[PDB]
Every structure is written in structure tokens, then in C-alpha cells.
């Protein structure tokens, strides 16, 4: 029988918070100028046999500045936080992001997924990809490059943060 998690998406604007989510959810690629604004989503997923109700909540654009609310602090499953490899500035606010995160959930182990997006551009690449899998490492998280444009890119992204929630 399933099971139910709530996966929230954090970063800086303009990484692909929205996109990759809906490449995930729909499918497919939309491109759009809207803001991302706070978007809750439900999708299916199978992860080693285990079929999950996924409550993604895509989150509004962060920076240094940005006041770490509290209810993205409690009743989440696990975090996904997306920074762009075209972009030093979304990679120093990611780190920014993480510390206020640790800080409000307390003493406890949460699954925490770094994702460096837009690694289709490689002629705007200004991160490397050892820098944020070091970064990474350096929070016990789990670290992938991905493309909103690339649909298996996305799907992992989902599926990694379900597989490092479920060993708890
Ligand atoms: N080439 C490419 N463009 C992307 C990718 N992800 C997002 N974008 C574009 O980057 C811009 C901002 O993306 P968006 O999903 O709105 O970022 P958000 O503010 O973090 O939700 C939009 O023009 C997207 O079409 C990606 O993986 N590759």
C-alpha cells in the first residue's frame, strides 16, 4: 500500500524550480516568464517497489536576505535545493538557504537533495561540477546536475530525494 511524502523545492529565483517540477509532473518542458509563485503538486511514484503519494510544494524565489520561514520547517518529508550552474550568485544563496535551513528544523537528520540545473548551457556553465558535489558532501546531501529540458534528469531528482528519505 502506498505511502504519502511532502517534498518541498527551495532556491534561488530563476533556477528551474518551476520547470523542473513541472518536467517531473507534466512531462514537459514549459517555459515562462510568470514568477514562481508557492505551487503545491501530487504525483505518483514508484521508488524500489514502493508506490508514493508525492506532495511537491514549489517554493517562491529565495536570497541571502529572504527571512527562512517556518512552515517550510516542520511537516516536510525532504528538501530539494536547486541552484543553476549559470549562476554564482543562485550558488551563493543556495548555501545561505541550507544554513537557515539546519537552523529551524532542529536536531534531527532530513533528507536534503542539492541539484546544480541548466547543465544543458554548457556555454554559460560558471559551476563546476565538483563544486557543488563537494558542497554537497560537506551537508551529507545528496548531489545531482539536471536539465529541466531532459525529462530522465528531472524523474531522478524525484526519485533520489524519495530514496534518501526512505533510510530515514
Ligand atoms: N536551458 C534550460 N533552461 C531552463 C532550465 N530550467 C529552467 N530554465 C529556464 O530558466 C528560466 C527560469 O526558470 P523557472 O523554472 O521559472 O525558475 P524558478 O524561478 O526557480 O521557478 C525560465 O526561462 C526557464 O525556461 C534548464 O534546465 N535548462
Do not use: C
Given at each position: ?8 523545492i527551495?532556491?534561488?529565483?530563476s ?12 512531462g ?11 505551487n503545491?503538486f501530487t504525483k505518483l511514484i514508484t521508488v ?5 503519494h ?12 529572504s527571512?527562512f520561514?517556518?512552515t ?5 518529508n525532504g528538501?530539494?535545493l ?29 533528507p536534503?537533495?542539492?541539484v546544480?540545473?541548466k ?12 563544486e ?6 560537506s ?30
Amino acid at each position: 500500500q502506498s505511502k504519502s511524502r511532502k517534498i518541498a523545492i527551495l532556491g534561488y529565483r530563476s533556477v528551474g524550480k518551476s520547470s523542473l517540477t513541472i518536467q517531473f509532473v507534466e512531462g514537459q518542458f514549459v517555459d515562462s516568464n510568470d514568477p514562481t509563485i508557492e505551487n503545491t503538486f501530487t504525483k505518483l511514484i514508484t521508488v524500489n517497489g514502493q508506490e508514493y503519494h508525492l506532495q511537491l510544494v514549489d517554493t517562491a524565489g529565495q536570497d541571502e536576505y529572504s527571512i527562512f520561514p517556518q512552515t517550510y520547517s516542520i511537516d516536510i518529508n525532504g528538501y530539494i535545493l536547486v541552484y543553476s550552474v549559470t549562476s554564482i550568485k543562485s550558488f551563493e544563496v543556495i548555501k545561505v538557504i541550507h544554513g537557515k535551513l539546519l537552523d529551524m528544523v532542529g536536531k534531527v537528520q532530513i533528507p536534503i537533495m542539492l541539484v546544480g540545473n541548466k547543465k544543458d548551457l554548457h556555454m554559460e556553465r560558471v559551476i563546476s561540477y565538483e563544486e557543488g558535489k563537494a558542497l554537497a558532501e560537506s551537508w551529507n546531501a545528496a548531489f545531482l546536475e539536471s536539465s529541466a529540458k531532459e525529462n530522465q534528469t528531472a524523474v531522478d531528482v524525484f526519485r533520489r530525494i524519495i530514496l534518501e528519505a526512505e533510510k530515514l
